Symmetry: C2
Subunit: 143 residues, 2 copies
């Protein structure tokens, strides 16, 4: 739709190392999730994530995040303005701007663990298998 | 929907080198496009592409391709059977199974060129900028 409001954060998932930082977006009205893998939490990683999320879900009206450096930076402020997307920040875990994405963090990590163990991976997923496993987890949660 | 029929092919786009092989899927009923970048045309690259496409569009009922090696291989036949997705092959360019995806190849390449030149890239896109540019092209065509 034309009035989406997203919540975005980062969560660490060592099953996906070396690119173990998962950037996670939930669309607040639909609950759809987009997830991407990153080697580090940086302003540019957030921006790469949102570029992917726009290609999957469409362009949102606003994004809610916490007040960490990758969200409060001049870089990210300009990227969001470039796209015409509004942005509000708050404290880590604030229920208003972040509780839904915290729940998606946990749903994703549980699903990644179940799929991985099912394929016989009890610890880190082999690098060559990670992309398809992450995409299967996203498919499964969105169904 | 639950009855999608896709057409998939590969097209070479040197603006995106070194990962210049674009895997392209169109959903035949909706005309939505998914595109991913690959360094080589292989059975596994097709499979990585379709894993992404399932996370974006949902699981299709069938996929139409040509009869190249990456589509007729025992590997790809098993991957598709694993997912419960039916598959038909035909001759390169057959209008029945491939004309729509050939049109998406051309729409994508034109859009990539327009965006790239707009950002001042007259030849290859800088590697660090390619992911977001490809995702912008996919967004723009699907809108």
């Amino acid at each position: 739709g034309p009035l989406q409001i997203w919540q975005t954060d980062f969560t660490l998932e060592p099953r996906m190392a070396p690119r173990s930082w998962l950037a996670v977006t939930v669309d607040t009205a639909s609950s759809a999730i987009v997830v991407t893998q990153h080697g580090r939490v940086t302003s540019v990683a957030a921006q790469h994530h949102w570029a992917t999320a726009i290609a999957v879900l469409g362009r949102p009206k606003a994004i809610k995040t916490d007040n960490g450096s990758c969200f409060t930076s001049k870089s990210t402020r300009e990227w969001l303005a470039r796209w015409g997307i509004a942005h509000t920040t708050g404290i880590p875990g604030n229920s208003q701007g972040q509780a839904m994405v915290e729940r998606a963090n946990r749903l994703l990590k549980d699903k990644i663990r179940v799929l991985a163990e099912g394929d016989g991976f009890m610890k880190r997923i082999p690098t060559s298998k990670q992309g398809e496993l992450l995409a299967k987890a996203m498919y499964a949660l969105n169904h």
